[PDB]
Amino acid sequence: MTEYKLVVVGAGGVGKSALTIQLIQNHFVDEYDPTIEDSYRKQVVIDGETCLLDILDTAGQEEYSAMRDQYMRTGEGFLCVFAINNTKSFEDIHQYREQIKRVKDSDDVPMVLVGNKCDLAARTVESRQAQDLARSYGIPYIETSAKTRQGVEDAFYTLVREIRQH
Numbered sequence: 001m002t003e004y005k006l007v008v009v010g011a012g013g014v015g016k017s018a019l020t021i022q023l024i025q026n027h028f029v030d031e032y033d034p035t036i037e038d039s040y041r042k043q044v045v046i047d048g049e050t051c052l053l054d055i056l057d058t059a060g061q062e063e064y065s066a067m068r069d070q071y072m073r074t075g076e077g078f079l080c081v082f083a084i085n086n087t088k089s090f091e092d093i094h095q096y097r098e099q100i101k102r103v104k105d106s107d108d109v110p111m112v113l114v115g116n117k118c119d120l121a122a123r124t125v126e127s128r129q130a131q132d133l134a135r136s137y138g139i140p141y142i143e144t145s146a147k148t149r150q151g152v153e154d155a156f157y158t159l160v161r162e163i164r165q166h
Ligand SMILES: Nc1nc2c(ncn2[C@@H]2O[C@H](COP(=O)(O)OP(=O)(O)NP(=O)(O)O)[C@@H](O)[C@H]2O)c(=O)[nH]1
Pocket: 010, 011, 012, 013, 014, 015, 016, 017, 018, 019, 035, 058, 059, 060, 116, 117, 118, 119, 120, 144, 145, 146, 147, 148
């Protein structure tokens, strides 16, 4: 079994916890809406390889977290999440990417740009705009809904594949 340390980042309210919980849930607990940053585990077979995913659901930059720097040092890949109905969350992506680059001292960190809440009609960030940004970073872009589950597994598995291909 190969272990991957994945970190989910992005602005307050974009759906970092909803995404993490949707991936990792065993559904014994009906509703789980975490209020605090935390770490979760999921075992999954990705392309024949049994993987243990350790997933850190971080708070947005506007919340204080003592361990944030060490989180980024430990993290092997990062899901950079914004919400497709929240332009500010999209503009904020630059800040998360600069923080990771500053801490890890690298331009080549495995990452996936995630445009969450794609179930919503009230879109303010066009897919093409986010594809352009992802292209500028040299990373994949994947739209998700934590409500419908669309794209959720693909986002996390794409990140694993980026780590593996690094
Ligand atoms: N329509 C829709 N709502 C979503 C989606 N993902 C999350 N939400 C909703 O958006 C809100 C924020 O979700 P949450 O998972 O707490 O986001 P967060 O990024 O972890 N927030 P925080 O930074 O404060 O921990 C909740 O009301 C949640 O139900 C999605 O894909 N679609």
